[PDB]
């Protein structure tokens, strides 16, 4: 059997969208940390498992679980991890990642082990997301507007309106957009309060050009985000990921 997603899985997942390093999961027994890097359609993720106790974990078994569609879109390769984890020890695995095509689902990391006479079972969403393959595209205003207008089919645009989770801090917002994988294009939207971005999603089989506009209303503490891309599922996925960052 598999544990349901741990409390805070979704909140924490959201912290690994625009950055690669952090603690993915921690309770009284176990700390799971991540460090990753991506280039083009590839990635390398280190997953670290720390035994916070003085007792060995036995039959320690981390498994990367991917839905059928996800497996066709995203190749994850990793090696056996030794099933014994000494008390106070930190062990690790390397996950080599290859994006074959655009994808919407996330892998689930399930960890099971014996701890003394107990059985432990933890499930968390693993932050391998489409924007990890999103790389910035610098371009002039004129070219941006040309490209924006070429993506005028209704299904190519996805929008969200949401309450700011964080202070609407101009410099941090810029940094988050860059961390998402977008270029930050200055003086495109004539309103200097707004943010405009462009990038390309790199997959083995295809590349997708994506444009975005983020419009803050500081008085109202809300944003409107617009994505345009040539693929409806890509517009949806990037819009929903990026929406949770501000």
């Amino acid at each position: 059997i598999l544990a349901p997603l741990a409390p805070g899985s979704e909140d924490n997942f959201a912290r690994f969208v625009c950055k690669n390093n952090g603690v993915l999961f921690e309770n009284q027994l176990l700390q799971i940390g991540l460090k990753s890097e991506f280039r083009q359609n590839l990635g390398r993720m280190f997953i670290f498992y720390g035994n916070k106790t003085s007792t060995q974990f036995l039959n320690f078994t981390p498994t990367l679980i991917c839905a059928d569609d996800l497996q066709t879109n995203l190749n994850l390769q990793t090696k056996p991890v030794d099933p014994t984890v000494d008390g106070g020890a930190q062990v690790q695995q390397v996950i080599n990642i290859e994006c074959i095509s655009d994808f919407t689902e996330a892998p689930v990391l399930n960890i099971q082990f014996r701890y003394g006479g107990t059985f432990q079972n933890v499930s968390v969403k693993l932050p391998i997301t489409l924007n990890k393959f999103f790389q910035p595209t610098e371009m002039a205003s004129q070219d941006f507007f040309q490209r924006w207008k070429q993506l005028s089919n209704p299904q190519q645009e996805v929008q969200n309106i949401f309450k700011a989770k964080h202070p609407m801090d101009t410099e941090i917002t810029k940094a988050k957009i860059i961390g998402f994988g977008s270029a930050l294009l200055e003086e495109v939207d004539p309103n200097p309060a707004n943010f405009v971005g462009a990038g390309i999603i790199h997959t083995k089989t295809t590349q997708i050009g994506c444009l975005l506009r983020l419009e803050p209303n500081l008085q109202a503490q809300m944003y409107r985000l617009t994505l345009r891309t040539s693929k409806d599922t890509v517009s949806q996925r990037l819009c929903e990921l990026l929406s949770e960052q501000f």
Binding site: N21, Q31, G33, K35, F48, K52, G88, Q90, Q92
Partner: peptide
């Protein structure tokens, strides 16, 4: 534990 990779 000291000895562990950290994530700050």
């Amino acid at each position: 534990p000291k000895g562990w990779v950290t994530f700050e």
